[PDB]
Design a protein around this nucleic acid. Sequence first.
DNA 1: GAATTGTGAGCGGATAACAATTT
DNA 2: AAATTGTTATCCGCTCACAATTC
Lengths: 62, 62
Amino acid sequence: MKPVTLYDVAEYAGVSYQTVSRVVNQASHVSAKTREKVEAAMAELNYIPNRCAQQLAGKQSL
Amino acid sequence: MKPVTLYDVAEYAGVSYQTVSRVVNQASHVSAKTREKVEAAMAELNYIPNRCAQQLAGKQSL
DNA sequence: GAATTGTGAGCGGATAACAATTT
DNA sequence: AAATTGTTATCCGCTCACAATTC
């Protein structure tokens, strides 16, 4: 898989796989650090949403 | 517009979603009778095969 | 035993729901 | 009960295998 996935972001930032989604949805059940951690990992990983599965799961963005 | 699915096709064709994909895939273990009735349903509802899904379920298909 | 066909697990990711724990 | 974080299954559309069916 050439494009990065939310799963890579979760693992990299060192959080649960729900945390990453949680941060993406800007949920209230998320601490500041955790939110910044996942958002940062998006840079290192060069996270580029999996348009294939993402559309299937909803949309090619959010 | 509204996205259609192999299920809408299956429902309108009165077949199983698998049957639809068997027709879409155009492989063996498929009778010509079902092929034409499923292909017909895709025209009705305007079914567009998700190449990203086909890639999700099919490893290195395209 | 194979063509037909249905049911389901799976891929791959995102979300909903839920559970342990602590407050 | 709710917050945090984690855990699990489901769901999306699609594909393949297997089981059951029928001949």
